Design a protein around this ligand. Structure first.
Ligand SMILES: CNc1nc(Cl)nc2[nH]cnc12
Length: 164
């Protein structure tokens, strides 16, 4: 069912995450962590304090799909065991130094062809698939986007609800 999912998404904020490679999204699914560039790190830290839930919606660039979505469970933190991100050109380990803990809500894919009816008011009402890493997605668009994903029956949202 979808009731606990809707409860988690109630009054949530949503951010598009654009990863350069599949490797880091796979690492994030395995370890429950994400790192972004400093401009987006600051925005996500502000949002984490401001809302009941901050949702990251992941898309690997050129994949034509979203790969899932997750909820921040922490602000970014440094000094952990370095996460072995595969680095794009021009991107360094120091830039990805801040580590967010995340709880996955859906690890299933959604093709862009299935979200073509959803536009994001915070990006000039372009299709929600369009946006830079870190682009915020307005509440209604983001809620409907998350509800389009196939159900992930491996996930139990009971523990996530109690973190809100
Ligand atoms: C682990 N974080 C990231 N990894 C990659 Cl491959 N690309 C990005 N663009 C913004 N953040 C990232």
């Amino acid at each position: 069912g979808t009731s606990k999912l809707k409860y988690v998404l109630q009054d949530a904020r949503f951010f598009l995450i654009k990863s350069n490679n599949h490797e880091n999204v796979s690492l994030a699914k395995a370890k429950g962590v994400w790192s972004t560039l400093p401009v987006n790190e600051k925005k996500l830290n502000l949002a984490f304090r401001s809302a009941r839930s901050v949702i990251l919606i992941f898309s690997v660039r050129e994949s034509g799909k979203f790969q899932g979505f997750a909820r921040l469970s922490s602000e970014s933190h440094h000094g952990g065991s370095p996460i072995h991100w595969v680095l794009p050109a021009g991107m360094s380990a120091k830039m990805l130094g801040g580590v967010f803990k995340i709880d996955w809500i859906c690890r299933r894919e959604l093709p862009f062809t299935k979200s073509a009816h959803l536009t994001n008011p915070w990006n000039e009402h372009k299709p929600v698939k369009i946006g830079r890493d870190g682009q915020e997605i307005e509440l209604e668009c983001g809620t409907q986007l998350c509800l389009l994903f196939p159900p992930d029956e491996s996930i139990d949202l009971y523990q996530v609800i109690h973190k809100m």
